[PDB]
Amino acid sequence: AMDQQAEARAFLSEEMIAEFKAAFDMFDADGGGDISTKELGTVMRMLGQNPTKEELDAIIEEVDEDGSGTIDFEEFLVMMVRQMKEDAKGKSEEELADCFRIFDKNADGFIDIEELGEILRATGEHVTEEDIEDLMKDSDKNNDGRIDFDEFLKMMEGVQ
Ligand SMILES: [Ca+2]
Ligand SMILES: [Ca+2]
Numbered sequence: 001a002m003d004q005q006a007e008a009r010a011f012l013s014e015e016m017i018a019e020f021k022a023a024f025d026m027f028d029a030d031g032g033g034d035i036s037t038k039e040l041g042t043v044m045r046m047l048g049q050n051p052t053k054e055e056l057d058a059i060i061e062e063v064d065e066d067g068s069g070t071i072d073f074e075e076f077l078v079m080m081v082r083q084m085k086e087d088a089k090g091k092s093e094e095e096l097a098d099c100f101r102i103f104d105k106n107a108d109g110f111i112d113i114e115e116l117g118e119i120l121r122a123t124g125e126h127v128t129e130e131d132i133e134d135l136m137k138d139s140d141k142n143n144d145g146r147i148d149f150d151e152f153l154k155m156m157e158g159v160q
Contacts, residue, residue: 008077020080023047024073034070037063043076049083100152110146 009017023043027035035043037060044051051059063075071079103111103119117132139147139155147155154160 004078005074008074008081011081012077017077020047020077021073024076032070034068034072035076037069037071040071040076040079044080044083047080049080049087051083055083096153096156097149099156100149103152110148111152112146116147 023046024035027039027043040060041051041056059079060071063071063079101107103115105115105118113133113136116136117129120127120132120135136145136147139151141151141154
């Protein structure tokens with residue numbers, strides 16, 4: 001939708017929008033402003049996105065409700081932006097998992113105040129022992145003294 005399309009544009013820098021167009025145009029000989037739904041996956045992949053086939057199929061079904069077999073550049077930017085958000089969140093969850101495992105030194109599944117202090121101290125920041133204990137306090141939601149992955153994610157993400 002026109003709304004959605006205006007928000008996809010807002011999300012991206014103008015040079016990036018022109019870089020996307022440059023690739024996109026390359027599959028539009030017609031200089032119609034649209035490409036074949038059959039090429040959608042290729043241009044997304046080229047632009048470093050990775051939709052699943054199921055995802056590709058969902059999208060095509062969503063833009064090709066008239067049967068013309070094409071996707072226009074405005075609709076393509078809405079798809080691109082949806083895929084980038086899904087992807088960036090995914091990396092972020094993956095990396096978080098990795099910071100957890102590392103924090104959990106003894107790999108018992110929990111961070112304790114000794115492991116929380118060690119990793120915070122190691123930063124070079126001047127954290128005092130009551131500053132580490134406050135962080136613990138605030139993040140430990142079931143008050144068992146440690147930080148489990150669930151509580152880790154809430155502490156890191158924030159809001160979370
Ligand atoms: Ca541990
Ligand atoms: Ca806890």
